[PDB]
Amino acid sequence: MNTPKEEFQDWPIVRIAAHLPDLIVYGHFSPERPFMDYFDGVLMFVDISGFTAMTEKFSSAMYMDRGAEQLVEILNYHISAIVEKVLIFGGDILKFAGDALLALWRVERKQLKNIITVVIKCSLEIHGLFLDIRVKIGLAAGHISMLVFGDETHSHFLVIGQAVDDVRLAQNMAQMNDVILSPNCWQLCDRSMIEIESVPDQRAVKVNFLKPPPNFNFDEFFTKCTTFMHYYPSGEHKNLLRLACTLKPDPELEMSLQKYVMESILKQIDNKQLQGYLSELRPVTIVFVNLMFEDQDKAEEIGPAIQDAYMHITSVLKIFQGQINKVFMFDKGCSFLCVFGFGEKVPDELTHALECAMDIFDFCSQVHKIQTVSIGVASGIVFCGIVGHTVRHEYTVIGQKVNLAARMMMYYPGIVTCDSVTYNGSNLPAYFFKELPKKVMKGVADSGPLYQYWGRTE
Amino acid sequence: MNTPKEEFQDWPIVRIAAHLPDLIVYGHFSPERPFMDYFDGVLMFVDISGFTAMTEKFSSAMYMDRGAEQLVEILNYHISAIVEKVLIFGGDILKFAGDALLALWRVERKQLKNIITVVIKCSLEIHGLFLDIRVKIGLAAGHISMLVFGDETHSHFLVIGQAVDDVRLAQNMAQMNDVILSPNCWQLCDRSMIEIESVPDQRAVKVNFLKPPPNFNFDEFFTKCTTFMHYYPSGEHKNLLRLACTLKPDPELEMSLQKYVMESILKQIDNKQLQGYLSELRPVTIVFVNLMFEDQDKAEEIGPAIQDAYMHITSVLKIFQGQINKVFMFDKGCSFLCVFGFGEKVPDELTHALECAMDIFDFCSQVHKIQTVSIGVASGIVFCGIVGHTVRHEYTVIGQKVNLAARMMMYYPGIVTCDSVTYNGSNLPAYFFKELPKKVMKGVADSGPLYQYWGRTE
Amino acid sequence: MNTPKEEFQDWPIVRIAAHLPDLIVYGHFSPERPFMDYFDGVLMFVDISGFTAMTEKFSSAMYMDRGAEQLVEILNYHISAIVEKVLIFGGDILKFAGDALLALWRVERKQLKNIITVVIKCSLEIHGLFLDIRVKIGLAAGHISMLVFGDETHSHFLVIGQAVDDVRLAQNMAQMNDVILSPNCWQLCDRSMIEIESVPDQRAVKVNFLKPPPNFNFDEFFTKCTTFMHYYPSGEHKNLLRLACTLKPDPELEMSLQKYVMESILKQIDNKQLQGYLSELRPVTIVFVNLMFEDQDKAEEIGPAIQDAYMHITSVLKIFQGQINKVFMFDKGCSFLCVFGFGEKVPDELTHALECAMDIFDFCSQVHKIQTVSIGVASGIVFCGIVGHTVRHEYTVIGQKVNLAARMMMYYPGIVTCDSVTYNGSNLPAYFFKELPKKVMKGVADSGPLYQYWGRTE
Ligand SMILES: Nc1ncnc2c1ncn2[C@@H]1O[C@H](COP(=O)(O)OP(=O)(O)OP(=O)(O)O)[C@@H](O)[C@H]1O
Ligand SMILES: Nc1ncnc2c1ncn2[C@@H]1O[C@H](COP(=O)(O)OP(=O)(O)OP(=O)(O)O)[C@@H](O)[C@H]1O
Numbered sequence A, B, C: 001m002n003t004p005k006e007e008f009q010d011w012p013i014v015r016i017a018a019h020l021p022d023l024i025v026y027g028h029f030s031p032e033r034p035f036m037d038y039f040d041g042v043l044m045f046v047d048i049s050g051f052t053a054m055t056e057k058f059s060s061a062m063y064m065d066r067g068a069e070q071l072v073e074i075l076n077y078h079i080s081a082i083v084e085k086v087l088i089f090g091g092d093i094l095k096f097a098g099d100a101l102l103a104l105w106r107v108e109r110k111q112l113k114n115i116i117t118v119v120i121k122c123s124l125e126i127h128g129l130f131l132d133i134r135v136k137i138g139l140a141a142g143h144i145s146m147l148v149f150g151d152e153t154h155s156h157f158l159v160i161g162q163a164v165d166d167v168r169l170a171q172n173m174a175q176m177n178d179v180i181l182s183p184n185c186w187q188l189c190d191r192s193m194i195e196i197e198s199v200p201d202q203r204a205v206k207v208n209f210l211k212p213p214p215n216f217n218f219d220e221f222f223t224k225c226t227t228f229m230h231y232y233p234s235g236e237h238k239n240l241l242r243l244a245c246t247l248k249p250d251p252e253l254e255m256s257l258q259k260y261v262m263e264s265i266l267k268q269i270d271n272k273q274l275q276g277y278l279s280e281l282r283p284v285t286i287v288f289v290n291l292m293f294e295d296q297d298k299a300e301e302i303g304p305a306i307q308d309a310y311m312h313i314t315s316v317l318k319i320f321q322g323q324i325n326k327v328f329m330f331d332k333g334c335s336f337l338c339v340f341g342f343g344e345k346v347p348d349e350l351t352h353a354l355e356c357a358m359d360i361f362d363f364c365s366q367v368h369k370i371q372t373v374s375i376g377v378a379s380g381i382v383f384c385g386i387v388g389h390t391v392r393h394e395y396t397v398i399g400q401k402v403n404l405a406a407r408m409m410m411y412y413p414g415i416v417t418c419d420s421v422t423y424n425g426s427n428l429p430a431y432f433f434k435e436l437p438k439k440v441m442k443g444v445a446d447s448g449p450l451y452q453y454w455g456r457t458e
């Protein structure tokens, strides 16, 4: 009787699960919203510095209208290699945001110290790897909360809390090529093996090297650590990067997981649209919404506020034809990265983006526990596409206007701002705006004039 | 000198042969029509009970317009596993009809007894495997005839005879989860190994278990049986589910095989249309045509009659824009499962379906050796797509209206009937119909009012 | 720590490199135009005789509108097998032209003799392999020059010189199934091992067999020869047909290589169009342009002339909507195989083809060092598609009109000619043409009337 080879089965549910972390794929939690859970772990935020500049260059004539194709290829070649190290070292990639990603090693509190060594080692191999591209890495460890918010057809998750704030702060300090530990990570780690230098005006520290003791064998130490890793591929499946590669059809699980993934991606998953059409350099409008709270580490406070704000944001995006591309905590606040055009006639798309932004601003300002709303609106050519590895990848955007909109909303809090492309392009009369003082902004060479969107009445 | 790996070659001819059994792929018989051949073998009819109800449910809002995608995924996951057992145990899958299939072990008469043991063992492993889904299995054995009918561009085949009637009868008796043997199968089998219980008002029997004797080794017994299996993958190709996976381009063979496969499937095979678009839940009209004969086990009588009727059916389907989806023998008659919309404006599609049905009814009623024509017309949302395994799969339909149309044509013989969706929707005046008595029908909870299509004149 | 399998990565750059030889992929030469380089090697020109006739037949009704699909399948099945032998024996396939190809073993001068034995052995295995299809093979050896010409967005290469003329001459002598050596190849080869017969009125010779001496082991001899093969897959990559399968993203290299490949192919590479649509039997107009030089073996003379002519050809093809499909040296001249329709309204496409041909004729006639321009214009159904192996394939055309246009331009030099389909179809008045004497042409049974395109004025 033959025992013929069974082919890898690339079911829709498996393709869907490439877009999500094990935290959701295997999570099985309540479908109620907001939902909150609490755990501990180590976080790694990995940033490839330089793709934003490359993005601009790939619009140039030398790329012969294949810029988006070339950009995504060279980006995924590099990011793929990082994704593989993360996964082989046992991490769960939570999200991609442009040319960066955030990973988690969720473990019981006693195991944090050892896993910190695993993550440090991972970081240093990543730092080793391989355009003018640098990698910066921030690490944090401690208490983490997860929030899941949404409606009956869409779900979104976030991690929240001091370790999440720390991992942002750490990454923002890294010089090109640093690996930075949050103060708490440094406090919890195996200091006898981890050799650091100090950081100016900071309690965070920079890793110089690992100095294992005489009897230390990394392979055996890792093996012990894998006792605590619920989904580490093993035994018959030890040749796989993710357990989620073995998921089987299950209509209930697929119904739940598809709610996290945008419809145009589901269309490609279902082989109803060609792959190529989602990788593009297209003119869009970014609307970057920031919500600040009295206490942004307290899920049970902020969770309902985020859900409330989400319910309105989504109804208003539907009307003005925008989408939520990504949601994450900044150091300061919960941020919604929304996109218009991914389109109407262009004075109209611009105008809608602005009216949508004002409406979200007015509504969210009144939501209980939201301290401040800030929104930045910027327009230009940005890269849109699927970034990552075959087994773990996400739709995302990269571009100078994405970063500019983020910087605006942070440096001009409490108001709606827009750049001159948006100002000049909109259908709206000039006295709906106020020309603003030029601020010097981290990461930004020249914004051109910035404006506040004051709105219809005085 | 390198000996580099030669990749699997997924030539068009191999993709075509996934849609057909070895009985045709390797058959090489005359292109004349009707063509008839005679042999012996064992038949297995496997039915997954429950997908028809799931189909209805997958239209519901919770599936978020991905019902067809989810339906086909969960269906193929299960059916694939059945297909693999059939093939590993040496069977040839002849056809898929919705969530059921029919398989054949063609062998010389002396080998029937032993192969019956193979098929029984296969059935019991299938029954073992793994929604509210049950599998029922009927088995028959004996003389089988094959008919091939068609025109210069299209070919269709059928198996005919007492073993084919028996396998239908057997399957219809199975309770959820039974494996039933036809009387003749029971008569021919190795009764010393096969432990059965009786079936009420029936000579067919139900299998309880295998009870092999002391010296029996299934692996060695199977190996002996494979001497008689012309196309069992072996030697260099023992890791393949089908020999047809190794077929090589051959324009003559491809010309002959493509005639069995519908044009929209050939378009997908040739990479001229996206895969996804053939899996759909779409409103269609089913026209289920049943031809009854004086003697439906006699190929040389019925073969010309079927060909004659086919020639007219196909010319009329062309005019009214329908297609033949599947042809099979019922216990009572040869049945053509035709589909409209897989479309025109809807009072028109409905009207055409009805006029086409009357025309086929009038013509076929006069074909020599056709005793009765019955036709059921039902309209609604049905699943359309490719069902099966990668190596063996077919386009088919599943839905409550498909089954209702089959039940109508059987419970209201000698006339054309339609359901109320078709009645109410058609462009035709009411006195073209007669409202019928409500019959209680096996498998059907509520038809709603049924009608006879009386036609234009009184 | 797992070491999971890394999948083959089918990056865009790798897909691009399937369309090009190692001579370009690994060439890294100046982007200036013309560019010329000089080397030595052995050439093999392999022609599958008979596909041109099959092409016509595959338009017939028996192929049921799947002629193009069936043609490309049966062609690639055969050509693939030839490509694999070439590559395993260490050759670099330079180009495909219809059902023929040209391969190169570039080596230092001392190694020519031994490599000639490798190529002969390759030829004889190819000749062994496997419709009414015959293979003919011509071999040459000696000095070869390479020219790269083009503009800022498009690049084309050619090989030039006496060994290139010889390999054309050799192939044209081969009887169905011969392997022919150029005089110089015969002169340079290991005559003690190579058993030949003479060719009438020719110094070229025909191979009968290899007669290795007593101690000769082909495997060990080949192994020695591979010392001189820069890109022979080896060590970890010895299971690969080409080193180019391991190419990594590199935006600069991709920018350079994509310039050789047509835009519609890049669109398919980038998954923005279905594969199937490039394989077709479509009515086109072939414009076959031949440029003759005083000395066609002298790259430094002809290189600038070709570049000059290219610059004008391409600007005129843009205006009249044609494309350059392939460029090669004939025995007599540099030939540009251009195609219109791969379309406008048909009296217009025909008319444009003709006006484009006259314009190219007028311009190129005045280019310094171009002795004669001849152009043949023929219209009909021709096969268009990607021919070759997965790892090495090219877009090309095959058909009786392609060959007729080539024969016209050779048998009617110094003028523009067209066939009667083009004549009768064009929008142009009859006195723009001259009816020509019927010449008997090698390869052509019946042209129908031929015409010179005299042009607008007398
Ligand atoms: N989806 C996204 N794609 C791209 N950028 C984003 C995205 N989401 C947020 N950003 C913002 O872009 C900024 C990038 O940080 P920074 O300006 O220091 O550049 P970088 O990360 O070193 O270089 P590059 O921008 O080339 O990656 C972050 O502050 C972040 O808030
Ligand atoms: N291509 C087809 N797709 C679906 N049903 C079909 C098809 N062809 C025929 N049928 C009819 O549907 C009927 C199914 O049998 P029955 O009503 O007992 O339901 P079942 O098979 O147990 O459950 P389910 O209908 O969910 O599979 C058969 O009588 C058969 O004649």
Ligand SMILES: Nc1ncnc2c1ncn2[C@@H]1O[C@H](COP(=O)(O)OP(=O)(O)OP(=O)(O)O)[C@@H](O)[C@H]1O
Residues within 6 Å of the ligand: C047, C048, C049, C050, C051, C052, C053, C096, C097, C098, C099, C326, C337, C396, C397, C398, C399, C402, C403, C406, C442, C443
């Ligand atoms: N891209 C091309 N596709 C098809 N034919 C071409 C192409 N380019 C040139 N040709 C011409 O077609 C001719 C083929 O040679 P010939 O007429 O002797 O037929 P053959 O090669 O034996 O048979 P077949 O034409 O069936 O392959 C060559 O002279 C060549 O110049």
Ligand code: NA
Residues within 6 Å of the ligand: A047, A048, A049, A050, A098, A099, A100
């Ligand atoms: Na970044």
Ligand code: NA
Residues within 6 Å of the ligand: B047, B048, B049, B050, B098, B099, B100
């Ligand atoms: Na069924």
Ligand code: NA
Residues within 6 Å of the ligand: C047, C048, C049, C050, C098, C099, C100
């Ligand atoms: Na040829």
